[PDB]
RNA sequence: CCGAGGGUAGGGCCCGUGACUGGGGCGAAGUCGUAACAAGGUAGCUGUACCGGAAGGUGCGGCUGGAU
RNA sequence: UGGGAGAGGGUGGUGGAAUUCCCGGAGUAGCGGUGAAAUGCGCAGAUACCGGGAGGAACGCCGAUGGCGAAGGCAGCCACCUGGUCCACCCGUGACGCUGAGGCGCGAAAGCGUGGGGAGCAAACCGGAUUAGAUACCCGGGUAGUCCACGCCCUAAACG
RNA sequence: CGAUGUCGGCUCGUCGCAUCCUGGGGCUGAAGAAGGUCCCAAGGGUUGGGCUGUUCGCCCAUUAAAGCGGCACGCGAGCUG
RNA sequence: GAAUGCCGGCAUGAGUAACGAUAAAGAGGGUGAGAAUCCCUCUCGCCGUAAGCCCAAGGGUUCCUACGCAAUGGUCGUCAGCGUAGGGUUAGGCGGGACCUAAGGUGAAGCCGAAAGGCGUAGCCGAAGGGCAGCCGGUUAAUAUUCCGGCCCUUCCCGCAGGUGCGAUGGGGGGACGCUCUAGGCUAGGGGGACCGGAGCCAUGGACGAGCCCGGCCAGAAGCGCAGGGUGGGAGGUAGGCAAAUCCGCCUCCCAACAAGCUCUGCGUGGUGGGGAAGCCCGGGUGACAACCCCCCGAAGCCAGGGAGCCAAGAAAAGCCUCUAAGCACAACCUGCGGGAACCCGUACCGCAAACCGACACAGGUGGGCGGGUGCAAGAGCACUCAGGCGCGCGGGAGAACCCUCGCCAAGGAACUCUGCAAGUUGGCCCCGUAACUUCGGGAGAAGGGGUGCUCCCUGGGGUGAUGAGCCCCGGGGAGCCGCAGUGAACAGGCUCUGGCGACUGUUUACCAAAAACACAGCUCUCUGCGAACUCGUAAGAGGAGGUAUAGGGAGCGACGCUUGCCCGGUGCCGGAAGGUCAAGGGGAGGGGUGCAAGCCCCGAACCGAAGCCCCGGUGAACGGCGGCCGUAACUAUAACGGUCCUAAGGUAGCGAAAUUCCUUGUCGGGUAAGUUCCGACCUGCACGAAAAGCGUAACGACCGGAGCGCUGUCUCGGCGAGGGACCCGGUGAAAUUGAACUGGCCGUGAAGAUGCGGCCUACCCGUGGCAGGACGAAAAGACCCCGUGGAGCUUUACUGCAGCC
RNA sequence: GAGCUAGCCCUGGCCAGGGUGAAGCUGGGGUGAGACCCAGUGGAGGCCCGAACCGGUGGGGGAUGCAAACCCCUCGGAUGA
């Protein structure tokens, strides 16, 4: 059947993308714990 | 005259529609459209704040003349009469000598090819505009201003009129549809005759996919729901109300006065509206 | 081939009968009231409508085959 | 051909009196109702009186033992559209007539459907009386309906 | 109660005997035939169907008879539901 | 040493289940250390509205080649989507961008919010919509509308020539639109040809033939031809299209008008460039100087912005054209021609799947296009089959029980069972024929029945031609032939009578309920006069609605028919300028603290003072409610009638043992041999009843009852057969569970059901296939039940607040 | 977090084939004119049968699955809410 996840590159960059996050306050902070965290991706990898 | 079907489905054997017999042009003024964006009864923040509406059929928005004393003095000729998805009056296509084209509401007997006219110097005649307090007691009207310049607010819909019931000072004294009796300004203009397609409430829709045309989804009771959602929601069974019964935020619906009280407007409401 | 008739199926008419039910006629030695005949104690009768334990009442309109 | 009378019919308009209600004024202790009462209404200002307004229905006098229509039935006044009918002339047609099973149309009131309208009245209904009782008569309320359009219903002491 | 799945049916039985039938007896208000009542006896047998989830029960047609109980009201790591 | 402890390791179950669709395999040859599994050939089977082909997502080198086989691959592996390495993706014209706008998002101005931030006309962004110039063939191991070849085209720049009042982000036209049905002419695609081209074949009894087999086209500028789309022309007036306007709009006049003309598209032809089969020869050569023609069928595609009908009335903006404004009129623009210029990103490969989503090379899920032929009435259905692709990554035997899926069955025919559950029956087309009832549509495919293949003869209309032959389509009438059987296979309703509920088509608990539940047209109450009421938001702002009482919100009821009674004392709502009560505030009689004092400070009565409540009234399709006792009639029985208690008032019409009835399987009637169900009745209705509607109702229902006919392995009652497993051999090899075990019966005992205690009985050691009675077998710290001053959802005239309103 | 699911908004796309045969229109009949009747034409509909497509009715299988909802048979809708 049909599952959850049903992936859309569009999608993908416009929801979690880097301007996305960037755009709103929490989006900030959640870039801001990623970096403190060390993360090496901040942000979904997504292939335009 | 509305058209019946014979019964050659279960749905036929009620359903009526319009006879669209004053329609004489099926397409409207390029110049004249729009188009109207549907809502889906959703506000700017994305939600419902008015239940039930979607899904009907595309409509363009004609841009309706309800001003009239924007042109005053000058005779326009009625080009046709054609439907309008967006109201229940069928409207009217003015040619105006000037060139100009715009379109008002049908009034009850407008004829194609009679001329029409605003101002105060009007003829007291079906499709003519003047201000209320030069049309005489006693002629019925519609298309009424509420507020002078303000454009026409009052009997617009299919069939409606007010009705010039007497003057008093700046204002005049109308009958509105309602049967409210109120005092208007008497520089609003008015449109003389009834609105017309009177038969539009004579309609049966006659099958749940005739309001889903319209736009209108189903509505569901507050009985057939459960206690989080509506103040007659749960019981075991079918339950009666047993409390007085309520709309979905919990106000009393039955007889209830909403009207704010201390509003403006009341010093000009003679009688509130009737049966 | 036709064919008495037999068989399958489906209709039409008529008769008898049926738990029960509707009113009707007769009976009369009962109960309730007394609607009509007198102006019958609300003049009567009437088509219709709604109503009442019952006869009946009332509305609307009609007739006189109504006493004074 | 020339005239006449008429609430004959249909449609659109329009007038005045009265009832009710609403507004303003003025005023006070009752009003209403009946055989007599009571319910009811009224000091939260009724009734009676004056001015203003809204609205529906019916048309006083004329009016008659009257007129018109096939019958049902038709009554303020104006206009338009339209039927029947009588008279005089004795001009035209030349028996073209009478009736009429079926058919078709019309058909008071009540009633029905869809929509309007709703003042007064008023089935049902509620209350007061009356009465032995009173699902009545009388009284105070009161919804259909009564009115308009369209469609049905097709009855009658539709009687001379 | 860190679970012993609860009615009824089906399947498969097995046991008790306070015995429904068949076998053996005594008494009889046992003439015979047919019964009644008690005693011995569990080897075998103890039907099909209508109703109802039913167990039970009533009914139809038979029968030598159409027994009653126990086995976690036997049997859901066997089925049904 | 225990915490169903934590991490890790390793056991048991066990050589056990399983190895992932029952589309299927066999042999020969090759390679190699090794071969059922890799390559090649022949044979066999399976898909073929796909299991073939192309595109978009998504994936991201999986593509091609060489070399490999430890691991991955459910076995094997020499193979591979695996390991290593090298190679491979070529564009002005295809897609997207340097164009447009849609929802929406963002947002100059502007508005709002403690902060963060929320809005917001314009503008901007935003596509799979609009717009825009490339087709055919060849080539690579691997790309190709991209490279090449042929023939076409677009924009930009510059120049030349001719032409013109040129010029725009401004005005206007246009772009520009639905649903259903549909005409004409075409193309795609397909069938046939006794005609054209072709390697060859004559078998096994016959055929050297009007034989078999194969193929018989594709692209193409200008021109031309056919079919269509689009558009009237001239003048005069002009006050409107936020300036201007010669444009557009409006008015008038004059020619024109199912015409033409002008224009644009489609199809045909077209210089030219290509392609080109079977067969047997080793992807390539030959076939071949290939031929390339006629007829028929024919779209849902094209002409197209075509036509008609209908109501629910069907985007925008740019490109484009026209108009003018500043300007500028040596410019500028337009037309033609010529030369130059023409950027960025994508392009491999998978793509109904072993490369995407499902932890797996997973029987699941995934949008668009092509999807041949024959026959079956049609069709994308069904059967077979083309092209093309596959045999599903464990096999080999055996021929038990049992399981699955399947086939048949004597006699019976629902006796099965909760229930005909399941499975039979029926089954397409043509013809005949068809009841109650009905809202006149229907019910209806009612029911029921007849026909159905093939051969010959005669004949009727239509399409294409030409009016004819041919082809293709739709018929009719005779006479015959064969079989058990002619929709001979495959696909393809069992039916009737009668109740309950819901009017109906729809909708629902994704993953235990599809229903009688929700919705629904329709009915009624009620609110709302517009900056509406109501909803979301602190607000601004939005929805409502660019709507206006024939409208919008809320509530109940639920097509339709016939109806919807009585009670307004309580609660609700509505009305009530009186009166009672009533907070802050006003008021300030009187009293107090303090000071030598003027003074400062505090308390405080009458009185005035809202909504709300009280109080008066209205109101039921507002919340709701709708009795009891005694007595009475020519036999009994009953009680029309009378009396009395109580109430706000005492259930009307209709219905009733009911989706409601406890007693209950009520009683009676029907059906049955027999009927706790069913249908019809009765009425002492435990405990119906009128919009939580009452009683009915044609049609409808994968709803729930009852009956009958047909037919059956449902059953009496079981038998046999088939395949996939189960079993055996080779390969690979889990799991929950597990205190340890050397783990028998009975009668007892024991914390009350013992392999483990006592007594007795029985018992050589170890497996394999089977069965499930026990191990109070496994699973899940019982979901019932209680307990905890544990939690959460819900309600209200519980308490207390808060929003909101007054 | 609405790449699942629910609703709405914008823009596209899809629905083989067959059946029934509403209004209207034409002709005929009918009438004073009408209503209306008959025939042909026509092609309506939350119409009918049935694929794609959307579902998920009953049974069977599956139940450490092919699968954390699947498979077979059967069955609902299929121009419309
Ligand atoms: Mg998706
Ligand atoms: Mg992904
Ligand atoms: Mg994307
Ligand atoms: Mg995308
Ligand atoms: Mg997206
Ligand atoms: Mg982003
Ligand atoms: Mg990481
Ligand atoms: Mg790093
Ligand atoms: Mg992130
Ligand atoms: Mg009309
Ligand atoms: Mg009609
Ligand atoms: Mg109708
Ligand atoms: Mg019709
Ligand atoms: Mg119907
Ligand atoms: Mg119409
Ligand atoms: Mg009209
Ligand atoms: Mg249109
Ligand atoms: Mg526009
Ligand atoms: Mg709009
Ligand atoms: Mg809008
Ligand atoms: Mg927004
Ligand atoms: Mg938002
Ligand atoms: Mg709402
Ligand atoms: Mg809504
Ligand atoms: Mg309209
Ligand atoms: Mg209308
Ligand atoms: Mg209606
Ligand atoms: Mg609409
Ligand atoms: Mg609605
Ligand atoms: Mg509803
Ligand atoms: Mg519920
Ligand atoms: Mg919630
Ligand atoms: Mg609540
Ligand atoms: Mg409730
Ligand atoms: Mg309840
Ligand atoms: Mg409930
Ligand atoms: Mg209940
Ligand atoms: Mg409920
Ligand atoms: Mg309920
Ligand atoms: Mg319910
Ligand atoms: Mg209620
Ligand atoms: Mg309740
Ligand atoms: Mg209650
Ligand atoms: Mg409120
Ligand atoms: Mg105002
Ligand atoms: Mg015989
Ligand atoms: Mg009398
Ligand atoms: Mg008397
Ligand atoms: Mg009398
Ligand atoms: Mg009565
Ligand atoms: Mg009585
Ligand atoms: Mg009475
Ligand atoms: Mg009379
Ligand atoms: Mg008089
Ligand atoms: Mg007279
Ligand atoms: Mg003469
Ligand atoms: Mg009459
Ligand atoms: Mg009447
Ligand atoms: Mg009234
Ligand atoms: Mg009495
Ligand atoms: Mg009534
Ligand atoms: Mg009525
Ligand atoms: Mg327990
Ligand atoms: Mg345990
Ligand atoms: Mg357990
Ligand atoms: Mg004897
Ligand atoms: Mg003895
Ligand atoms: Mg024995
Ligand atoms: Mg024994
Ligand atoms: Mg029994
Ligand atoms: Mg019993
Ligand atoms: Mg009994
Ligand atoms: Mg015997
Ligand atoms: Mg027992
Ligand atoms: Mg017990
Ligand atoms: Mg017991
Ligand atoms: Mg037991
Ligand atoms: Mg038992
Ligand atoms: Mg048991
Ligand atoms: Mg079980
Ligand atoms: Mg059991
Ligand atoms: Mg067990
Ligand atoms: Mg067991
Ligand atoms: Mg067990
Ligand atoms: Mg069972
Ligand atoms: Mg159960
Ligand atoms: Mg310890
Ligand atoms: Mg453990
Ligand atoms: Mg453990
Ligand atoms: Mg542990
Ligand atoms: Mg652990
Ligand atoms: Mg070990
Ligand atoms: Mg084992
Ligand atoms: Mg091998
Ligand atoms: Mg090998
Ligand atoms: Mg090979
Ligand atoms: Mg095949
Ligand atoms: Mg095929
Ligand atoms: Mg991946
Ligand atoms: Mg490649
Ligand atoms: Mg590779
Ligand atoms: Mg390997
Ligand atoms: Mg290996
Ligand atoms: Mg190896
Ligand atoms: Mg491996
Ligand atoms: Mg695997
Ligand atoms: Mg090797
Ligand atoms: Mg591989
Ligand atoms: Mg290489
Ligand atoms: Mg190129
Ligand atoms: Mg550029
Ligand atoms: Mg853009
Ligand atoms: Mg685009
Ligand atoms: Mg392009
Ligand atoms: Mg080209
Ligand atoms: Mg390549
Ligand atoms: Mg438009
Ligand atoms: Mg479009
Ligand atoms: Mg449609
Ligand atoms: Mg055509
Ligand atoms: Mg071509
Ligand atoms: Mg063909
Ligand atoms: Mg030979
Ligand atoms: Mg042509
Ligand atoms: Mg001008
Ligand atoms: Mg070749
Ligand atoms: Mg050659
Ligand atoms: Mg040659
Ligand atoms: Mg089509
Ligand atoms: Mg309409
Ligand atoms: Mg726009
Ligand atoms: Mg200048
Ligand atoms: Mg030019
Ligand atoms: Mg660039
Ligand atoms: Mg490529
Ligand atoms: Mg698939
Ligand atoms: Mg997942
Ligand atoms: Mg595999
Ligand atoms: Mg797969
Ligand atoms: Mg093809
Ligand atoms: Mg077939
Ligand atoms: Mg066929
Ligand atoms: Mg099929
Ligand atoms: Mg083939
Ligand atoms: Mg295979
Ligand atoms: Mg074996
Ligand atoms: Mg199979
Ligand atoms: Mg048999
Ligand atoms: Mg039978
Ligand atoms: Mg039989
Ligand atoms: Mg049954
Ligand atoms: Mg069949
Ligand atoms: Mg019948
Ligand atoms: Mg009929
Ligand atoms: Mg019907
Ligand atoms: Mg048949
Ligand atoms: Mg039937
Ligand atoms: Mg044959
Ligand atoms: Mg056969
Ligand atoms: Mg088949
Ligand atoms: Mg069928
Ligand atoms: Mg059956
Ligand atoms: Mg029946
Ligand atoms: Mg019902
Ligand atoms: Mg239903
Ligand atoms: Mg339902
Ligand atoms: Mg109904
Ligand atoms: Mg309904
Ligand atoms: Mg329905
Ligand atoms: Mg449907
Ligand atoms: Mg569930
Ligand atoms: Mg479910
Ligand atoms: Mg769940
Ligand atoms: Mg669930
Ligand atoms: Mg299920
Ligand atoms: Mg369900
Ligand atoms: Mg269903
Ligand atoms: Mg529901
Ligand atoms: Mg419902
Ligand atoms: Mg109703
Ligand atoms: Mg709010
Ligand atoms: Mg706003
Ligand atoms: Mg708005
Ligand atoms: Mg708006
Ligand atoms: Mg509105
Ligand atoms: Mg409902
Ligand atoms: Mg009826
Ligand atoms: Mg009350
Ligand atoms: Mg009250
Ligand atoms: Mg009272
Ligand atoms: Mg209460
Ligand atoms: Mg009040
Ligand atoms: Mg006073
Ligand atoms: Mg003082
Ligand atoms: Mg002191
Ligand atoms: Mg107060
Ligand atoms: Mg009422
Ligand atoms: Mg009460
Ligand atoms: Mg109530
Ligand atoms: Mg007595
Ligand atoms: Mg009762
Ligand atoms: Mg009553
Ligand atoms: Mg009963
Ligand atoms: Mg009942
Ligand atoms: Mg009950
Ligand atoms: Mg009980
Ligand atoms: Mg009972
Ligand atoms: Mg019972
Ligand atoms: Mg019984
Ligand atoms: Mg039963
Ligand atoms: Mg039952
Ligand atoms: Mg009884
Ligand atoms: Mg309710
Ligand atoms: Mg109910
Ligand atoms: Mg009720
Ligand atoms: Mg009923
Ligand atoms: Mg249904
Ligand atoms: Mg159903
Ligand atoms: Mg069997
Ligand atoms: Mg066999
Ligand atoms: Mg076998
Ligand atoms: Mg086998
Ligand atoms: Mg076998
Ligand atoms: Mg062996
Ligand atoms: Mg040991
Ligand atoms: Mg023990
Ligand atoms: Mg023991
Ligand atoms: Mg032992
Ligand atoms: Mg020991
Ligand atoms: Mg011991
Ligand atoms: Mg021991
Ligand atoms: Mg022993
Ligand atoms: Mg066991
Ligand atoms: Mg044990
Ligand atoms: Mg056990
Ligand atoms: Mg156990
Ligand atoms: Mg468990
Ligand atoms: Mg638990
Ligand atoms: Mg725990
Ligand atoms: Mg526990
Ligand atoms: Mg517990
Ligand atoms: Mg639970
Ligand atoms: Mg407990
Ligand atoms: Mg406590
Ligand atoms: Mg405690
Ligand atoms: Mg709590
Ligand atoms: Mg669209
Ligand atoms: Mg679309
Ligand atoms: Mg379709
Ligand atoms: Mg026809
Ligand atoms: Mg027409
Ligand atoms: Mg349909
Ligand atoms: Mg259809
Ligand atoms: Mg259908
Ligand atoms: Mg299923
Ligand atoms: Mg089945
Ligand atoms: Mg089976
Ligand atoms: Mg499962
Ligand atoms: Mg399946
Ligand atoms: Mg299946
Ligand atoms: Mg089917
Ligand atoms: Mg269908
Ligand atoms: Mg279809
Ligand atoms: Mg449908
Ligand atoms: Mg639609």
């Known amino acids: 059947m049909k599952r959850t996840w049903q992936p859309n590159r569009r999608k993908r960059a416009k929801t979690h993308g880097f301007r996305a996050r960037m755009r709103t306050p929490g989006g900030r902070k959640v870039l801001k714990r990623r970096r403190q965290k060390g993360r090496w991706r901040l942000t979904p990898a997504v292939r335009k | 005259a509305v058209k019946k079907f014979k019964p050659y489905t279960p749905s036929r054997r009620f359903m009526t529609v319009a006879d669209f017999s004053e329609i004489t042009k099926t397409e409207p003024e390029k110049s004249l459209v729009k188009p109207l964006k549907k809502t889906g009864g959703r506000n700017n923040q994305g939600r419902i704040t008015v239940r039930?509406?979607?899904?009907?059929?595309?409509?363009?928005?004609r841009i309706i003349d309800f001003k009239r004393w924007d042109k005053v003095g000058i005779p326009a000729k009625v080009a046709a009469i054609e439907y309008d998805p967006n109201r229940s009056a069928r409207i009217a296509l003015l040619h105006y000598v000037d060139g100009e084209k715009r379109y008002i509401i049908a009034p009850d007997g407008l004829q194609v090819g009679q001329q029409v006219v605003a101002g105060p110097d009007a003829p007291i005649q079906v499709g003519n505009a003047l201000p209320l307090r030069f049309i005489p007691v006693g002629?019925?009207?519609?298309?009424?201003?509420?507020?002078?310049?303000?454009?026409?607010?009052?009997?617009?819909?299919?069939?409606?009129?007010?009705?010039?019931?007497?003057?008093?000072?700046?204002?005049?004294?109308?009958?509105?549809?309602?049967?409210?009796?109120?005092?208007?300004?008497?520089?609003?203009?008015?449109?003389?005759?009834?609105?017309?397609?009177?038969?539009?409430?004579?309609?049966?829709?006659?099958?749940?996919?005739?309001?889903?045309?319209?736009?209108?989804?189903?509505?569901?009771?507050?009985?057939?729901?459960?206690?989080?959602?509506?103040?007659?929601?749960?019981?075991?069974?079918?339950?009666?109300?047993?409390?007085?019964?309520?709309?979905?935020?919990?106000?009393?619906?039955?007889?209830?006065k909403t009207r704010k009280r201390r509003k403006p407007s009341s010093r000009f409401i003679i009688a509130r509206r009737k049966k």
Request: with cysteine.
């Open chain 2, 52 to 61: 039930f509406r979607g899904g009907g059929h595309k409509r363009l928005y």
């Open chain 2, 139 to 256: 002629t019925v009207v519609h298309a009424v201003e509420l507020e002078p310049k303000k454009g026409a607010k009052l009997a617009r819909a299919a069939g409606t009129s007010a009705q010039i019931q007497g003057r008093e000072g700046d204002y005049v004294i109308l009958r509105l549809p309602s049967g409210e009796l109120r005092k208007v300004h008497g520089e609003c203009y008015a449109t003389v005759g009834a609105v017309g397609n009177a038969d539009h409430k004579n309609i049966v829709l006659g099958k749940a996919g005739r309001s889903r045309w319209l736009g209108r989804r189903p509505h569901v009771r507050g009985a057939a729901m459960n206690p989080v959602d509506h103040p007659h929601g749960g019981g075991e069974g079918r339950a009666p109300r047993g409390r007085p019964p309520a709309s979905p935020w919990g106000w009393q619906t039955k007889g209830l």
